[PDB]
Each structure stands twice: as C-alpha cells, then as structure tokens.
DNA sequence: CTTTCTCTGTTTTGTC
DNA sequence: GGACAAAACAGAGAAA
DNA sequence: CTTTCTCTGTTTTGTC
DNA sequence: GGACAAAACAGAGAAA
C-alpha cells in the first residue's frame, strides 16, 4: 500500500491528487492534496520550508524566496545590485546617496543611522526613545 | 492595555511570563508564554523562522541554524572549511578524496556521482533505478 | 566583541 | 470605524 | 540551461 | 515488533 504517490486510488471518496485554491482571490494551484491542504492553512508546502504565516495573502508574496529571479534593480549607474524585496532596495540606495534618515529623539543622544535595524538596536540597547 | 510585554499582570490566572519545557527530556527554556506555547507544538519561535517540524527532538537540533558557531571541521591539512551539520562534512571530504560512491544500477547507464543530490536528480529525471 | 549592510515576516501607514 | 496595498519596521544574520 | 557543491527537514539504517 | 541515535537521503539552492 505504501508508494510514491496518491494517483492510484484508495477505497475512500473521489480521488485524483488535487489542484486549485480559492481563499478569496488566490490564483495559484499546488500539485497535491497534501500540498494544497498545507497552503490552505497558511503553511508553505515547498520541501525544506514549512513556515507558518500570519496572512494568507503574504503566503503568495513569500513564494519569491523560492524563485531565483530578482526583478527590482538599483538605479545607480555602475551598480549591478538586484533585489527581490522593495525594502532592501530602499535602504541599499542610501549607500550611494549617503543619507542617514534615522535620528535618535532622546535629547542627550544625537546619533544618526543609515539603516533602520541599526536604529532599532540602538533604542533596544540604550532604552532611548522608548516607552 | 496594548504594551511591549506580558510582565504587568492582567485579570486572568497566575501570570509572570513563562520559562521551562519538559516533553520527555527537553532541557531548554523560552523567555515567554507565547514562545514556549509555540515550542511545545513543534514550531520554532525565533523571530523570522516559524517553521513547523515533524519531530520535537529535532526542534532542539534545528536551533543550530540560528547559532553562528560551526563545531564540525574538515580534517584535510590546508582546508579551513567548517560545518554545523554532519552530512555536509561527509560529502565535502569527497572533494579531497575524489570518491564517487553513487553508481546507477540501471544496466545501460553506468554513471557515477560524488554527491547524493546529483544522484537523486539523475534517477528522478531518467527514471533509472526507480520503481 | 565591532560596523556595515541585506533579508524577510509582521506591523504601520496611506489612500479610498 | 472599514477595506487594501505600499511602505516601513524589527529583528535576524551574513560579511569583513 | 549547465556542473559542482553545501544546507537542512525527514527518512532510513544500525545497535541495543 | 520496540526504542533511540547516527547516518543518509532528497530535495532546495547558492555559486560559477
Ligand atoms: Zn491560497
Ligand atoms: Zn516557503
Ligand atoms: Zn546600488
Ligand atoms: Zn540615542
Ligand atoms: Zn521541548
Ligand atoms: Zn528556527
Ligand atoms: Zn576540506
Ligand atoms: Zn542512470
């Protein structure tokens, strides 16, 4: 009874693998009943992933980590950098412009930061600009 | 009512965050009720991960991807390579030895392979040594 | 340990 | 209040 | 598209 | 048959 697939039928009810999803405008189809069952409950079925997600709409957006293509480009002349995610692009451009948009509001401290993660870390460590 | 933490008490029942796990010999403690609740049901609570797992015992072994340390070493003289996982080390050593342990059993084909993933792919594409 | 920078799951903001 | 999509955050974490 | 090689969640194997 | 840990697999996927 144990085999590679669920194409040969068991004594159950109307089987032939599975395909399409719905979930209010989900236009994507897994190639298995187990895969679409996971997709339906906000889990990435791709082998090796298996991540839970809060939003079903993001589960579709998540799939780009599994694709090898990088649509977003850096617009600076000699710069070949590419991205899958908009935020990476936004912060990367600062490397060219030199900008340091984040400014600690705590009055003693006057530190500026280029990237938000450095800014979040400064506040988490010092307690500046917090509460 | 919405805040950073669950240290200030609500009107519920015996609260003060959470800590230790059990699950038959799980000697690891999350620093939150939400984190340990996820751990208990085979989900990695670390932020950005959120992967489901089949075995609870592996959930502990999984945590090494989040640590930056690489205990396993390559024993060849000038080779600085290091690993977190035993299988990576085993297959990597073949680069030095030259070995090609995988041999297609299909009679016409006589192809050898160094790494198991190349061997699995050959069989999946050709249907050699399958069924 | 540091600094610099990218990745990505969730939260916040902006427009209707 | 509600969509819903765009942007931003807040970590994780790779590289030097 | 290719080849070469590493990562890691699950399965298989080996020892008791 | 059952532990349980060690090894191996089977993809994914990064690099050239
Ligand atoms: Zn869907
Ligand atoms: Zn995924
Ligand atoms: Zn650039
Ligand atoms: Zn400050
Ligand atoms: Zn546990
Ligand atoms: Zn994890
Ligand atoms: Zn080596
Ligand atoms: Zn073959």
Author numbering:
A (entry chain A), B (entry chain A): 1225 to 1355
What does the paper say about this structure?
Relative of Early Flowing 6 is a DNA-sequence-specific H3K27me3/2 demethylase that contains four zinc finger (ZnF) domains and targets several thousand genes in Arabidopsis thaliana. REF6 and ELF6 share a high sequence similarity comprising an N-terminal Jumonji N (JmjN) domain, a JmjC domain, and tandem zinc finger (ZnF) domains in the C-terminus. The ZnFs of REF6 are found to bind CTCTGYTY (where Y is C or T) DNA motifs directly and recognize specific nucleosomes. Here, we determined crystal structures of the ZnF domains and REF6-DNA complex, revealing a unique REF6-family-specific half-cross-braced ZnF (RCZ) domain and two C2H2-type ZnFs.
Attempts to cocrystallize REF6 (residues 1223–1360) with different lengths of dsDNA resulted in a complex crystal with a 15-bp DNA fragment (m5). The structure was solved to a resolution of 2.7 Å using the SAD method by SHELX C/D/E. In the asymmetric unit, one REF6, one dsDNA, two glycerol molecules, and 79 water molecules are modeled into the density map. Surprisingly, only helices α3 and α4 insert into the DNA major groove. Helix α2 of the RCZ domain is situated above the major groove while helix α1 projects away from the DNA entirely. Conformations of the holo-REF6 and REF6-DNA binary complex differ greatly with an overall RMSD of 5.3 Å. Therefore, residues 1291–1293 act as a flexible hinge and dsDNA binding induces profound conformational changes of REF6. Structural observation showed that the DNA was bent by 16° compared with the standard B-form DNA duplex.
